[PDB]
Nucleic acid binder design. Structure first.
Lengths: 500, 86, 205
RNA sequence: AAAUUGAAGAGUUUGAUCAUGGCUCAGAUUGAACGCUGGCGGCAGGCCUAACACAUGCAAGUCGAACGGUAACAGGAAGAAGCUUGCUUCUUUGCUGACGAGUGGCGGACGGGUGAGUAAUGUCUGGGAAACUGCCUGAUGGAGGGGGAUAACUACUGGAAACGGUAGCUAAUACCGCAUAACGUCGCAAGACCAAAGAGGGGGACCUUCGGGCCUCUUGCCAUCGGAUGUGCCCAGAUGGGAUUAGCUAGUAGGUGGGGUAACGGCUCACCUAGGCGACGAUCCCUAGCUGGUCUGAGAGGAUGACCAGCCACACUGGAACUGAGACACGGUCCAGACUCCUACGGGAGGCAGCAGUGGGGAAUAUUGCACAAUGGGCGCAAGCCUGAUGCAGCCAUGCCGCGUGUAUGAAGAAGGCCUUCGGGUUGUAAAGUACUUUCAGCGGGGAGGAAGGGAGUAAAGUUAAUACCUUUGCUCAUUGACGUUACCCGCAGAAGAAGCACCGGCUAACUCCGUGCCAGCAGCCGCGGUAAUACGGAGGGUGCAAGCGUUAAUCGGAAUUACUG
């Protein structure tokens, strides 16, 4: 209330094809350079960092661009007032970059861009402008108000222009916020900690906070125990501009959503439980449909063989995002499904979950609990943690590829022609043979054919030469053969034995 | 130690420990001289040694290094034995 | 915490008038008094021994407006107290303020009297008592407080009261709208088709 | 006067019966959970599981009236100046209000947490004799004269950090001699031997080296004998089960002597005797903290040991002692182990079973809150500082208790629903209508108590050279509440914002229709379901409870079904 309007620091997100040195732009401004200090060499996580530079104040947010992160780039666009798209003259435009174009226009967020490489001689700006000209986005001096910036990103060259454009682009549009009032906003990323407990990184649209104030995120509710901002361990107050990690919530909330503070917690309890009921009702609803959808007691074909996986990732943002990419590798032949996606770490009921149905237990980042090790070490299971999602997406596929059992044809072991049949009481017949090629074996299957068509098929029961009854006969050595359930032996036909 | 005074107490108790150790070692020495005389059968050496020992088992009692009763037994015990021989 | 539904149903189930309405009307012109509620009211209960005990306890509870928990606690206290337990139960009920307010005629019903109490219209010894179950003692003086004295409910209530049998153990001044709980009522003061010993039997088994 | 003056039975074996005998129900109780539902308040309760592991804050300090002291901030000052001549900013100097770091004193052995270990260096009951015991207390005397050090600091230097190395230098209520020394210790006695410390408040002649002397009172220090409280020790009885455990024991049992403890003692050692325990249960094995009490039962019993209080034991695991009146130390030390954190790679650091909080386990158990205002603890002469003890607040229907969710009037008794032999019955005075009330929630207004003290002055007594000071007791003045928007009282608006849960075949309070058809399903026990199902599922109606109601779990009861009573 009061309709108080105060200026704020613009929240900016950056998108692109992987490798435009999107991270480098931030770290150089931050004077940090945390890049390539982490596993994978690339940024697989989202974070927001506010810096203090003239003129005024500005904060930076970044999301990696990959086929896998469909959700993160979608949510990051609508939350930010200004979007930046990194582009390289060497890279040009790529299908991941055009994917970022749609997120800029659909979120009706104004866009400014920067050329990443002025250092390399084979890199030219004119190529970037013209090729992206075809797309309505990124006009330059054509009356489309969009401005291009040329930065070294390694050289650390201004930048002066890019920074100015960003400040100006936020300046030309009216900045609306309020210093005091009812706090509200969105959640960047949520994860689970062992000592601290469940936490969330929250952008506050209206900037206000207090240790005693009750906060409600999604269907989760609770009082804030403590506040943490970036490196700073404790902050007393937080404005609509700078982001602050929230702590003390009941449980790990959704990867992102609208958060609203309330006066009293008791009034907010019924509301939070109400959202759970709807989410549970649709959960059972989608459960009944998928099972009844087949309209039959089983699958019409032999794809029934499937693989199960168990996943718990430390961060809440990943489990929803990478699972979508994990359902992309799914095929009709082998079906893979996720069971019991966790908010973090590992637990007794999780190891029990993998005990009932055979599955691989994997985590984006996790450590084994003291009670967890006892169960995993006892029963036969597999515990594998992966720093990057790419090494994970490859091996799950590997697990699936192995599952397959296809025999498309075998290699004959030997081929033999039979002559001068003999009579035996046990098998009913013994066909004298002469091996023309290869080696005949006992338990290997055979194909009996006459005039190129197969008269009969079977697997050898007895291979006997003379009274020796040897298990193996080479080529051009007299040999003997008999089999059960074969009535008629005729000369001129050839028996083909083949290994499997 | 974690607390300010806890740190200080450990320092003081170590000083006291080295103080007490020194005086206590001295005292037992002068007690042992008496038992050694006794075991060699000399009245005089053992009485003489008892007279040097007396004031210091008494003093260390007054000073809390030992209790009064300990000082007394030592004097009682040695006195018993030395008299029993000469 | 209070029975809020239809009242004559209760009378109809127990087979008697429970005085849950003012008494301005012959009860038989307001309901089918001699028939239980429901589709099968005409049906007769060939009623077990447990049944007669239950219904008698219900009857007394429904007269005084007491739910089970409080009434059981009333039995416990009657039992603990010296002298006949059954009679002690009725002393305790009859000593309730909502009840006494009704008997002095300040309320047309115990329900109405209870509302008077809850709504801070009743004083005991010139002190405001607003809880219905307040136990009233010999020599206490309960009164309508000055501001509640012009309520027309109270005048009507005192008129009807004047037409009921007049209780011995209360001295009521209708003009002042004050009255005095002289003494605990004896057993002989209270209706004789209440079977306390049945209620006593129900709660000992 | 009163204060254990109290005790129920039902269903189910059979065609039926009586007996036998188990199963099952009605009852109370719970640190509960789950399902449906959910308005307010008072009081209580809240990790029963992993004695699993823990990020972060906080949970033990305080005294300048013991001491050298200034680095912070605060004034003050010869003298620098802000100078617009009384307002002042900085250079200086501990001059003082205070106070970081340091020595020193007292407290860190209490308060708080847990129940792992322990069938006995435990607990309970009742007794013993060989002992110590800070602070507080009564008694009687000391409190003399000296000495060598040291942290801080200064200079030089090593470390990433933690924390060091050299040499200087200095104080004390730190530390040590010497004297003094009995109603003390040793000794038959004669004799021999043992301690200490100052610091403040005020002041009359008197005066100096202007520090004080000296006068005076407060307080601390030493000795010895007591009191009080605390603690150590010893004996007897009782305090779980198992013989599908019957033998156990070399410090073992005792004796002598030396040593040892605060003290008795195989506590320890040497020597000697050959004992000691055990079917009245030793040894071994399993389990477990004990009690007051708690729940149940008419009782006798049975079950049990959260919350409150007493004792014990433990403090990451195993071991150890140092300091101290007290510890083998919950936020001390050392060693070893398990584990974790920091690191510039060389080295460091830590222990939530304190209060919050986190991960984990689980069917399941709360906020990283406010305040020292009150009671109580530590330090201090005090003022005061510290106190996650405690007082309070938040969360959860977890339980107990209270209250509300309206009161009265309202008939051919409407519409709708339900049953019906279509006559009518019912839901039902229920609803609508009509008046009427306003608790509680909402909103404004006012306003107890938990506050005793402590602070300035004042006056009187005891003091004393003294009207100082000190201390006690009266007087006035101005003040101290985290809870707090307190309890409670007054006003405003309108029935307005406040009803669900299980059950209805017998046991067992509550019956009909439709659907289904040995299916779908119910089910505490018997037992329901194949065309009339009061037993399934829906409906209408009804019964029982009610901010709860059901289901599950759990102890005792009924069970005279371990029977001492019986």
């Amino acid at each position: 209330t009061g309709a108080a309007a105060e200026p704020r620091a613009p929240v900016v997100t950056i998108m692109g094809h992987v490798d435009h040195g999107k991270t480098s732009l931030l770290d150089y401004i931050r004077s940090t350079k945390v890049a390539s200090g982490e596993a994978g060499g690339i940024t697989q996580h989202i974070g927001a960092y506010h810096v203090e530079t003239e003129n005024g104040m500005i904060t930076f947010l970044d999301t990696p661009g990959h086929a896998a992160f469909t959700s993160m780039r979608a949510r990051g666009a609508q939350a930010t007032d200004i979007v930046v798209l990194v582009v390289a003259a060497d890279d040009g435009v790529m299908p991941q970059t055009i994917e970022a174009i749609q997120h800029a226009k659909a979120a009706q967020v104004p866009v400014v861009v920067a050329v990443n490489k002025i250092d390399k001689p084979e890199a030219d700006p004119d190529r970037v402008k013209n090729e992206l000209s075809q797309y309505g986005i990124l006009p330059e001096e054509w009356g489309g108000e969009s401005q291009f910036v040329h930065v070294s990103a390694k050289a650390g060259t201004g930048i002066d222009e890019l920074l100015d454009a960003i400040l100006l682009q936020a300046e030309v549009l009216e900045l609306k916020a309020v210093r005091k009032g009812m706090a509200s906003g969105a959640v960047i990323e949520s994860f689970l900690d062992k000592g601290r407990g469940p936490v969330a990184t929250v952008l506050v649209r209206e900037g206000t906070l207090h240790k005693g104030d009750i906060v409600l995120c999604g269907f989760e509710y609770g009082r804030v125990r403590a506040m943490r901002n970036e490196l700073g361990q404790e902050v007393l107050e937080a404005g609509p501009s700078i982001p602050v990690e929230i702590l003390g919530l009941s449980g790990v909330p959704a990867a992102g959503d609208e958060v609203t503070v309330v006066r009293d917690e008791k009034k907010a309890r019924e509301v939070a439980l109400y959202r759970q009921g709807k989410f549970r009702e649709v959960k059972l609803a989608r459960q009944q449909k998928s099972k009844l959808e087949n309209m039959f007691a089983n699958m019409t074909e032999g794809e029934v063989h499937e693989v199960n996986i168990v996943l718990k990732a430390d961060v809440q943002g990943s489990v929803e995002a990478i699972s979508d990419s994990l359902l992309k590798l799914s095929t009709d032949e082998v079906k893979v499904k996720i069971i019991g996606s966790g908010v973090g770490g590992i637990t007794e009921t999780d190891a029990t979950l993998a005990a009932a149905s055979n599955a691989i237990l994997v985590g984006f980042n996790v450590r084994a609990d003291a009670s967890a090790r006892k169960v995993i070490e006892a029963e036969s299971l597999d515990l594998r943690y992966y720093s990057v999602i790419y090494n994970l997406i490859d091996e799950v596929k590997a697990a699936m590829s192995g599952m397959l059992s296809p025999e498309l044809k075998q290699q004959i072991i030997g081929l033999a022609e039979v002559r001068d049949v003999f009579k035996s009481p046990k098998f009913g017949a013994i066909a004298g043979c002469m091996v023309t090629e290869g080696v005949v074996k006992r338990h290997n299957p055979i194909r009996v054919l006459r005039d190129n068509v197969v008269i009969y098929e079977g697997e050898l029961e007895s291979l006997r030469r003379f009274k020796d009854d040897v298990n193996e006969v080479r080529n051009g050595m007299e040999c003997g053969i008999g089999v059960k359930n074969y009535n008629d032996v005729r000369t001129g036909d050839v028996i083909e034995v083949f290994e499997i | 130690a974690n607390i300010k005074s806890a740190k200080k107490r450990a320092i003081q108790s170590e000083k006291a420990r080295k103080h007490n150790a020194s005086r206590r070692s001295m005292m037992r020495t002068f007690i042992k001289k008496v038992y050694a005389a006794i075991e060699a059968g000399d009245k005089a050496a053992a009485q003489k040694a008892f007279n040097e020992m007396q004031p210091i088992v008494d003093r260390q009692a007054a000073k809390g290094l030992i209790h009064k009763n300990k000082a007394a037994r030592h004097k009682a015990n040695l006195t018993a034995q030395i008299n029993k021989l000469a | 915490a209070r029975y809020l539904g239809p009242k004559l149903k209760l009378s109809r189930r127990e087979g008697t008038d429970l005085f849950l309405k003012s008494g301005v009307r012959a009860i038989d012109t307001k309901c089918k008094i001699e028939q239980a509620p429901g589709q099968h009211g005409a049906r007769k209960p060939r009623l077990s021994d447990y049944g007669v005990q239950l219904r008698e306890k219900q009857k007394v509870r429904r007269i005084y407006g007491v739910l089970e928990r409080q009434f059981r606690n009333y039995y416990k206290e009657a039992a603990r107290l010296k002298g006949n337990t059954g009679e002690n139960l009725l002393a305790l009920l009859e000593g309730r303020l909502d009840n006494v307010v009704y008997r002095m005629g300040f309320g047309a019903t115990r329900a109405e009297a209870r509302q008077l109490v809850s709504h801070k219209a009743i004083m005991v010894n010139g002190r405001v008592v607003n809880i219905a179950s307040y136990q009233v003692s010999p020599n206490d003086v309960v009164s309508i407080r000055e501001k509640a004295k012009k309520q027309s409910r109270v005048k009507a209530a005192l008129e009807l009261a004047e037409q009921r049998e007049k209780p011995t153990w209360l001295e009521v001044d209708a003009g002042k709208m004050e009255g005095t709980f002289k003494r605990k009522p004896e057993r002989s003061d209270l209706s004789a088709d209440i079977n306390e010993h049945l209620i006593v039997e129900l709660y000992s088994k």
